[PDB]
Every structure is written in structure tokens, then in C-alpha cells.
Amino acid sequence: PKMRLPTRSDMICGYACLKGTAAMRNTKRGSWYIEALAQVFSERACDMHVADMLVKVNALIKDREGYAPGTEFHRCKEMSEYCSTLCRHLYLFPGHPP
């Protein structure tokens, strides 16, 4: 009568773009996604759990558009997404304790 586990659980995966689409990358600034991720995480890992921080990333990504005048591929878009089998809030508790 021991508790047993499913074969897979407690993962969360952030993906930079949606199924069937390519991902926006800036030769000078890296990918839209990595950049949003670092700022959301560096600012909010102190008070917001990881799935919620991935929602704020989604919010940043949704609002951004490509600046590549010339190639129709200007004003172009991407959408990120995360998938989760988490079973509890994931707080990273940065700098605690000292």
C-alpha cells in the first residue's frame, strides 16, 4: 500500500513559439523569448511563481512585432506557450536564505 508515481510528472516546459511556426531571433539581441524570460525572471522570481512568470512572458511576446522593413516579414509575430505537469506552486525563493 505505498504511494506510487505516474511515469512522468512535476515538469514545466516553456516553448518560444507555437506548433507549425518558427521563432523570432535578433542577430544583435538574441531571441525575443530568451530576452523576455530573463527580464521577467530577474524582476519577479522574488514574488511570482514560475508558471505565472511564464504567463507574463507570454504577455511580453504577444505584444512584440518584427522590425524588418523590406522583406514582407516586417510587423511579423510570434507566440510563446508553456505546458505543465506541476502539482504545487514553483517559487524559486531567490537570495533566501543568505
Binding site: 530568451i34 530573463a38 509575430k77
Partner: protein
Amino acid sequence: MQVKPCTPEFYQTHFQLAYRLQSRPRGLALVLSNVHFTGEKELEFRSGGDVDHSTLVTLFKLLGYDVHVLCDQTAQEMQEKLQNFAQLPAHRVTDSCIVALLSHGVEGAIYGVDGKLLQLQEVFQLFDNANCPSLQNKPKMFFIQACRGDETDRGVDQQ
């Protein structure tokens, strides 16, 4: 880049309802970037891929992870080295884990610098409850910067 620390009050009011996340280091992290291709197929030089790579290394360090790195790996090397990373005994003693993969990709899979595909299902599997007893009931984060098609999105104008 800096990460603002959380207040002890904040930690006191939330830990009972969160994954335990207090060990030091908070877990291992793997940042694996493929930037230069072989190109035994198709695949373009990922200009900008070094900023992403650098940005993640920095982030995961400031967040308390012992960060491993790999660059320009074939599909088969990714698989072998991911497996070795999943089997590290340090996982027995840490609270969490992080893996980032940055390459070109298709839906469900990522490219090695050799233009051969590594299935994401095979990746997740190396870290699951059967293969990675050390991380059982521990949160595992993955971040996947890779194409899932080649279509760029024209987008749509809002009503």
C-alpha cells in the same frame, strides 16, 4: 542583470504550499546551444544565438543554479550528454532542475549541429520518474528555444 531577492516574510508565507526549493545550489542547470551548423542539411548559422546562451547562463547562476554548458552538439551527443547530466548524483541533494535547449527545430524535436533530429519526448523521458529517481517529486523546468515549423506568422490586425 540582477535578480531581486525575496523577503523572509514572503518565504514564510509561501513555502508550505510550494515545492521545497531551499538547497544550495538550488539545482543543476544545463544550457545547451547549437549555433554553428554542419550543414549536412539546410540549417542556417544562428546569429544572435550567443546572446541567448550568455543571457541564460547568467540568469540561472544569479538564480542559484550550478550551471553546466554545452555548445554545438550532434543529435547523438545531445542524447548521450543529456542522459549523463540526468544521471549526475548531485541531483540526490538538490531541490530542482533546469534544462535549456536552443537550436533549430521542428514540431516535437530539435536539431543537432549535424541536421539530425533529437525527439523532445526522448528528452523529457531521461528526466522522468522511472529514469531519474533522484529528481522524483522535484520540479523540473525545461526551456526550448527552437522552431516548431518554418512559417513566420503574419499576424492579424485587431478589430
